[PDB]
Every structure is written in C-alpha cells, then in structure tokens.
Design a protein around this ligand. Structure first.
Ligand code: ZN
Length: 355
DNA sequence: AAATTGCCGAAGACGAA
DNA sequence: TTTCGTCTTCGGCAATT
C-alpha cells in the first residue's frame, strides 16, 4: 500500500530534466548579474537547498529553493528577546558595500532585500527565451520568488542569506543532538561550517520588523539528508537501503493533501514534518530500525511521534532547542486539535486521502 | 580569475533471475 | 509479486585554466 504510494510520488526523469534545464538557465544568469560591478551583492555564491536537492521532493519537480549567500565578516549578533532564532545584525567598517543598508550600526533586512529584489526584477525582464516572472513580495518570506512557465508552472525561491564563518550562536549549543546517531566528529565538523541568516520579513508592524534576521540551517539539513545513516554505507551501492527518506516523503504527502482542502491547516508546513523526523532519527539511530521491510511500522511510529507533539504542543527546533514550533504563539490550539483530528482518521482508515 | 573541468554518488528506467 | 543489476542523467565539489 505505502509502497505503491511512493511509486506515485516518485519523480520522473523526463520531468526532472526539462525542469532543471530551465531553472539552471535562469538561476545562473541571475547569479551572474548579481556579480557585475557596482553591485552591493557582488560576492554572493549559490547554494542549492530544499526538498528537490535533498531528493525528498514528491510528485513533480515544480519547486526549487536557491540560496544566494553573502559573506559578511566582522559581524555582531544580538538575540531578539529570548527567541534564539531571531537576531539583529550589527557591524563592528568604513567603505562597506552594504553601508547604504545600515541604520546606524544595525543592518536592515528590509532595505537589503529591497535592492536585492530590484536587481533580480530588472534582470528577469531582460529574459526573452524563457517565460519567467517575479511574484509579488509575500509577508514572512525571505525569498524573491520566480514563476516559470515551462509551460508547466515552476516556482524558484531565491533566498538572500548572510554568511558568517564564526562559531554558531549560543542558542544552538545544545542543538543538533546527533551524538549517538551520526557522531561527535560529524557534529563538530558540521558546526565548523558557516551559519546563515535570512530576513524574517514580517509585516505585522511589530518592533524591529525591518531589521530582524532568522537562522537558517538548510545546508546542514541537506548534508544530514545525504548522510543519514549510523553506518557509512547506508543507501550506498555497497550498503543497504533504509526507509528514512520515504517516511519523510509519505509524511510530507499526508500533510500536503490535508492542507489542500482545509484552510484550518494553514500555518502548518513541511518543516514541521521535517523537524519531527529529525527527532525521530535521533531517538531511533540504528539503520536496522529503518529497514524497508518495516516501512509500515516506521511510518506509523513517525505519525505517533507527530501526534504526541501536537498533544503536548511541543516541537523543538532541531538546531535551536528553545524555539518551540508548536507554541501557543505561531499555532493556535484549535489548529493542533484539528490536524490531530484528521491524522488519526487517515491513520485508522488505511489512508483514504492517499487516493 | 571567472567558469570550465573531472569525477562519481544518488537515484530514475528497464529488465532478467 | 517484486527487487537486484546495469545503464542512465543530475548535482556537488574544488582543481584547473
Ligand atoms: Zn539510508
């Protein structure tokens, strides 16, 4: 049953080729335009992220995430309240290329993202060989979203990010609990990689809204997805397949089908599901606990874990323990009850919504 | 020095044991 | 049933020109 669902969700090579061809054409040209002189984003580099590049994209290759990361040395972070995820960015710098984005010492995400969008929008109108347009700025989004007609609709989220090469913020110190799973050497190496800040970009009118940045660990998540086994040979050609990624695919699919016809399930997203399975992979680190022969039981325990997260209203950010994804803030209690009331129904009735 | 080069892992497609 | 093996393309990474 679940095996058949996965086959339906599996991407087609023909679709992948046609989509990637067009996307790569657009992204590289935009990345190049960003590199020409007199540009404040002259040093930006590309880092592909999200479901497609983690090979957990389902149904169709019609959504692509791309990070345009800017190296920002000499950075000074200030934690926004007791959040742990949200920060203000201060500089310790004379002729700075982003000096016109500064409000005193404070780096404005709104001003920087504005000019970033302006540059992309100008280059997009110069594209004549591809049907591509820039979607209107959406509240809460750190990305300039492209709409491509290939003729099939394709969305490309170009995410502006600040790259810092120093130690990760102290709010992440007790995060990434992969010690008994991927090990201490892997964790230490991962945390020697840079961390990333993206614009939080809310329009609620709250204080600091134009200058609040949020942590992004999309790169770390991507590595983890590609290196997810306790054994080094997991899912390799001389190793054994596990069902970790397919459980994620199935859980992603269950949520999306539910979100389609229920507006109450808004404010829920794939990242909640992704976060949950990361905790699950931590609690069940053995590759033998994720055998393909036990796909049904593996998916069921993921559901049980998720349901318990709803019931207790607690889903800690995998990298930032303080940040509860299921707080009373962000998500109302009525919403968790509703999703819980739709999950067990699907769970008990052999998943009719998969059809 | 901007971007081509060299390599092969991950996984989609097909197919015989 | 499948699934294992082989062939295939896409992507990631840095050495190179
Ligand atoms: Zn695996």
């Amino acid at each position: 049953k679940l095996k058949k669902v996965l086959d339906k969700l599996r991407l087609k090579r023909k679709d992948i080729s046609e989509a990637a061809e067009t996307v790569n054409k657009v992204v590289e040209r935009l990345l190049r335009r960003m590199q020409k002189r007199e540009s404040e984003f002259k040093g930006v580099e590309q880092l592909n992220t999200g479901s497609y590049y983690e090979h957990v994209k389902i149904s169709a290759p019609n959504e692509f995430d791309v990070m345009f990361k800017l190296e920002v040395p000499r950075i000074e972070l200030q934690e926004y309240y007791e959040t742990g995820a949200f920060y203000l960015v201060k500089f310790k710098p004379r002729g700075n290329p982003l000096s016109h984005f500064l409000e005193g010492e404070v780096l404005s995400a709104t001003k920087m993202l504005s000019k970033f969008r302006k540059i992309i929008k100008e280059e997009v109108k110069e594209i004549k060989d591809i049907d591509v347009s820039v979607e209107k700025e959406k509240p809460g989004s750190p990305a300039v979203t492209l709409l491509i007609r290939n003729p099939e609709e394709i969305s490309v989220d170009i995410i502006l990010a600040l790259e810092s090469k120093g130690s990760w913020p102290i709010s992440t110190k007790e995060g990434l609990p992969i010690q008994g799973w991927l090990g201490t050497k892997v964790r230490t190496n991962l945390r020697r990689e840079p961390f990333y800040l993206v614009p939080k970009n809310a329009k609620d009118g709250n204080s600091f809204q134009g200058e609040t940045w949020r942590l992004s660990f999309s790169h770390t998540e991507k590595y983890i997805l590609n290196n997810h086994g306790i054994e080094k040979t997991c899912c390799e050609s001389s190793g054994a397949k596990c069902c970790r990624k397919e459980c994620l695919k199935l859980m992603k699919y269950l949520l999306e089908q539910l979100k389609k016809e229920f507006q109450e399930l808004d404010a829920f997203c794939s990242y909640h599901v992704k976060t949950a399975i990361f905790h699950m992979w931590t609690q069940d680190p053995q590759d033998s606990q994720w055998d393909p022969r036990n796909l049904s039981s593996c998916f069921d325990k993921l559901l049980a874990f998720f349901l318990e997260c709803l019931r207790t209203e607690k889903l800690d950010h995998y990298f930032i323990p303080k940040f509860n994804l299921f707080s009373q803030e962000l998500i109302d209690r009525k919403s968790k009850e509703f999703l819980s009331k739709k999950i067990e129904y699907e769970r008990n009735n052999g998943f009719p919504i998969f059809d």
